[PDB]
Every structure is written in C-alpha cells, then in structure tokens.
C-alpha cells in the first residue's frame, strides 16, 4: 500500500470520530481556537501557521467565529490588513469544553501505541516534513 | 505537540505539493481512478472504501468524471441504485500520466525516511487504525 494512502484512511477515521463527538467544532476550527488561547492577540497572518490553515480558510473561519461571538479582533491603525485575534468569554467556554473531548478522540488512536511508539511516530512525521 | 496536529502539517505540505504538480487531479480523485483501474467494473459502494471516500463525495466526484469522459458506469438491472465503474480510454490516459507525478510527490516526503523507517511508519499507522 501507499503510506500516504493509509494516512488518509487513519485521518478519515479520526475525522469521523471527531465529527461525532464534536459536531459543531472541526479539528481546524479547534486548532485555531487553541492557538488563539496559547497566544492571545496573535496576528492573523501568524495564526495561519500556528493552526495549520491558509489565509483564505482562516479569514472565512474567523469571520464565522466573530459573527457567533466566539472571536474578537482588532486592527493595526497603520495597516487595517493586519488583525489581532482574541477569544471571547464564550469562546473560552467553547474551547474549554472541547479540550477533554478532543483529547479523548486522539487517545482512541494514540492509545493503541506505546509511549516509545508515540514518541517515535512524532519523529518520523517531523522527519518527512519540509 | 499533538501527533494529529503535526499530521495535519505534513498532510497540508503534501497537498500543497500535489496541487502544484497535478492541478487538475487531487489525491482523492487520484485514489478513485487508481482503485477503478485496479478493479475494472468495481461496484460504486465498494469504491468508497477502496479509495477512502464517502458515498456522497464519491457520487459527486464520479458524476464530474463521467461528465468529462473519464469514467464510464453501468447499472444493476434489479437495482439501479447499484452502479459499476470503469475508466474510459481518456481516463486511462489521465491516470497513466499522473502516476509518475504522484509517485514523485510521495517520494519527496517518504524519501526522507530509510527503508526501515518507511516500513515501520506503515506499521504505526496501521496499529492506530480501527
């Protein structure tokens, strides 16, 4: 088989479990909220790398989060293209409730590996990346 | 870091290279065409697992491939819901031209691992799957 083919299978199974347990928060949405909480006021262009997204995908997703009162943003006075992102009080509640759920979904797959197998799996993924 | 987080990073980098080299054929589209060529006349419901897709995603994608003369389908006379999928002559040409391109994109990431690291990476992904 192809290694990237079975990776799609493992990823699809992970997405299927994640969607069932967290119907209103996908993994890219969850990663965006986690990165904002790790660095309140993070610049939106830096949030692209921190949450593994794109400029267009993040701008769309942040606009929906903003419209639902979960995300607050400010602008650079010298360049309104630059924006800084914060979690609202409701956003902190949504993220705090999702963290134990998301951790349990990861544990369903990672828990099948030993501690040495988990630490090494992280080494191989990092070795393949650019 | 989270193992499934870095997996998104590695997957996003792989998709970015794949989109640049194969602008008109994504990896799910490529996997569907590969599975049809491996089993000509495969039932559409079996193509879901063989290509790592869903019933709705595959039906949408096969309809577009059919409209572009790349995919040919027949129906069960006792149940028109069941369909069997073939590659057309143009579909075989599109897939044959994409295989060396897609293999080189995989090699960009897998080639950074030794043969033992590649064989073992496949073991860990299989161990995590349901």
- Are the C-beta atoms of B85 and B73 separated by less than 8 Å? yes
The H-or-E segment that residue A87 falls in is: strand A79-87
Which residue bears the tokens 């491996």?
A: B38
Domain total in chain A: 1
At residue A68, φ and ψ (nearest 5 deg) are -100, 15
Using a CB-CB cut-off of 8 Å, the residues of chain A touching B21 are none
Distance CA B80, CA B73 (A): 11
Q: Which residue of B has its CA nearest to A6?
A: B125
Q: Which residue of A has its CA nearest to B112?
A: A128
The CATH code of the domain that includes A56 is 1.10.10.10
Using a CB-CB cut-off of 8 Å, the residues of chain A touching B22 are none
Distance CA B71, CA B87 (A): 5
Q: Touching check for B126 and chain A: CB below 8 Å? A: yes
Which residue range(s) make up the domain with A107? 3-128
- Are the C-beta atoms of A31 and A111 separated by less than 8 Å? no
Query: What is the resolution in angstroms?
Result: 2.0
Distance CA B57, CA A31 (A): 25
């Amino acid at each position: 088989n192809k290694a990237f083919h079975q990776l799609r299978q493992l990823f699809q199974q992970h997405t299927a479990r994640w969607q069932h347990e967290l119907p209103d928060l996908t993994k890219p949405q969850y990663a965006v909220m986690r990165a904002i909480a790790d660095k309140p006021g993070i610049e939106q262009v830096a949030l692209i790398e921190a949450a593994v997204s794109t400029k267009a995908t993040l701008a769309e997703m942040l606009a929906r989060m903003e419209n639902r009162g979960l995300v607050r943003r400010e602008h650079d006075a010298a360049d309104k293209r630059r924006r800084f992102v914060w979690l609202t009080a409701e956003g902190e509640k949504v993220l705090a409730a999702a963290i134990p759920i998301g951790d349990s979904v990861d544990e369903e797959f990672l828990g099948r590996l030993s501690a040495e197998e988990q630490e090494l799996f992280m080494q191989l993924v990092r070795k393949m990346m650019n």
